Amino acid sequence: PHARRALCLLLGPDFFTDVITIETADHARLQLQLAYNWHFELKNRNDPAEA
């Protein structure tokens, strides 16, 4: 919930080495490591509201 804390909001492309605990229709409980290839998007990188 709250582990890391930094002064900067990383906008560059990155990933999250997250693992989920999902269950399929056959009830098969399996955990699975995810990446979430993400990146922040700003069309106008000067507007105070959007920024």
Binding site: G12, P13, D14, H39
Partner: protein, 42 residues
Amino acid sequence: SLPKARDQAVFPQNGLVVSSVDVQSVEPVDQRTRDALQRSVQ
């Protein structure tokens, strides 16, 4: 190129291009894939 796909694995986030992917050996770790496929060998 059934049919072959391409020759480039590009990541647009940073421009990192994986030219090719090479896998060395299939281990399977369990002893039961092991000398039971070894009876298959025999």
